[PDB]
Design a protein around this ligand. Structure first.
Ligand code: 3E6
Ligand code: UDP
Length: 407
């Protein structure tokens, strides 16, 4: 088959879509990976053996006054500048005509579109190509969308209405409580393509990255890795509470931190924090090799925002989770793993959802420091790792997904 894949302009979408493209090409399918040029330029390289089977189709983002040239992804357009989020949405929707032109002559068997691709779904209908909508999260999250407790909701609803199939990233082995209960979303069949845990070969990072050389100098399971994915906002006041919570709990840490918009370098972290913690902690204000870090012997707990990629990556390497969900599917993901006893959420105010250094330190202590509770979280995370890291199981689910596309 020729499968056209259209990821949302966000690294939590681009990365698993690139892995799915290579899983399809590995089984002898042709893939057109449709995105914007700077986003494509920032992706890990395709395996040389698959080079002719994964075609990158670069559609330039239209120019929108006030949207920087090159600001193509949610990693570039900050959530703390909602006016720019809106300009990026307008630019994204401007891809409609170039995409429809491409699809007309593509000889596509399937279009697989992401959560806001209402125009790509419209093009699939126009060109009589079946359309699958990606909702590459947990079964628990898909259940939440079915029973929740243009606007974003309208963009999603319209994309779903024009699709024939909804694609989740889980399996009955991981969510036996939920997967058997799900049949349809807006009357469209739900299919699960497994957890699709990533591969080092697919995420080609540097094993000589400064963060990995620092981890090399720390003893086994001694380091709390801290990362909140590629896009969620965390304002400077919240950065300081997270910093001081890490300091007070006293563990070694490696922290991949994105800067809030318009915050000075001198203001980013608490006064003297970097000096006081220099001996036990590293803050990297750049993209880090997360797969190399989570695969590293020095990492024990993972302080995660519970993005679905990070949840799967943490558990595939048997890390218990210290969970700080920010938006979207992160709350449901955090509650799902808490219910599996493999991590604990940082306390949040029942009112404004705020956290402080005491809540951060208490969660770190419970998961990573206190002998008895940390031992149990570690054992429970290892039980989940048995399911998450079963690569043969998740490859069988990809085969099943391809059979669904045929049927
Ligand atoms: C009904 C809904 C289900 C929902 C679940 C999460 C989901 C959706 C966003 C669809 C795409 C996948 C996914 C997993 C996601 O987070 O992707 C993720 O979506 C992100 C964008 O959110 C992307 O960037 C990521 O790449 C992507 O993975 C999905 C659709 C909209 C959602 O609800 C809407 O959440 C907005 C959040 O905004 C977000 O709020 C954040 C603060 O919390 C801001 O930082 C952020 O800029 C803003 O977009 C909020 O501002 C609106 O008020 C609210 O809509 C209102 O909901 C009410 C209750 O259901 C209704 O009664 C109202 O009629 C309805 O208008 C949220
Ligand atoms: O410094 C970073 C930050 C993130 N990631 C990767 O970016 C993805 C983040 O996706 P997730 O669903 O966890 O969160 P999102 O960014 O969508 O909020 C994961 O595959 C991470 O491995 C990375 O490699 N380095």
């Amino acid at each position: 088959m020729h499968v056209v894949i259209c990821p949302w302009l966000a690294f939590g979408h681009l990365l698993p879509c690139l892995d799915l493209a290579q899983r399809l090409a590995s089984r002898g399918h042709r893939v057109s990976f449709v995105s914007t040029p700077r986003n494509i330029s920032r992706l890990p390289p395709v395996r040389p053996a698959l080079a002719p089977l994964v075609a990158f189709v670069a559609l330039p983002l239209p120019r929108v006054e006030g949207l920087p040239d090159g600001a193509e992804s949610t990693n570039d357009v900050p959530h703390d500048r909602p006016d720019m989020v809106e300009l990026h949405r307008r630019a994204f929707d401007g891809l409609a005509a170039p995409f429809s032109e491409f699809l007309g002559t593509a000889c596509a068997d399937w279009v697989i579109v992401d959560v806001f691709h209402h125009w790509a779904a419209a093009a699939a209908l126009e060109h009589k190509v079946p359309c699958a909508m990606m909702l590459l999260g947990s079964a628990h999250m898909i259940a939440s969308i079915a029973d929740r407790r243009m606007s974003l909701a309208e963009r999603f609803s319209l994309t779903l209405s024009r699709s024939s199939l909804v694609v989740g990233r889980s399996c009955v082995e991981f969510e036996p409580e939920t997967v058997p209960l799900l049949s349809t979303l807006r009357g469209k069949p739900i299919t699960f393509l497994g957890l699709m845990p990533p591969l080092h070969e697919g995420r080609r990072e540097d094993g000589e990255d400064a963060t990995v050389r620092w981890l090399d100098a720390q003893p086994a399971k001694s380091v709390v890795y801290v990362a909140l994915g590629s896009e969620v906002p965390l304002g400077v006041e919240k950065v300081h509470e997270l910093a001081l919570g890490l300091e007070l709990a006293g563990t070694r840490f490696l922290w991949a931190l994105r800067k809030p918009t318009g915050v000075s370098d001198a203001d980013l972290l608490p006064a003297g924090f970097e000096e006081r913690t220099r001996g036990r902690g590293v803050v990297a204000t750049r993209w880090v090799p997360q797969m190399s870090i989570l695969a590293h012997a020095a990492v024990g707990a993972f302080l995660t925002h519970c993005g679905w990629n990070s949840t799967i990556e943490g558990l595939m390497f048997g890390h218990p989770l210290i969970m700080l969900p920010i938006f979207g599917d992160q709350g449901p993901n955090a509650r799902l793993i808490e219910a599996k006893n493999a991590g604990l959420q940082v306390a949040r105010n029942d009112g404004d959802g705020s956290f402080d250094r005491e809540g951060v330190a208490a969660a770190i202590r419970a998961v990573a420091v206190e002998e008895e509770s940390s031992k149990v979280f570690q054992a429970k995370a290892k039980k989940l790792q048995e399911i998450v890291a079963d690569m043969a199981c998740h490859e069988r689910y990809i085969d099943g997904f391809i059979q669904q596309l045929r049927s």
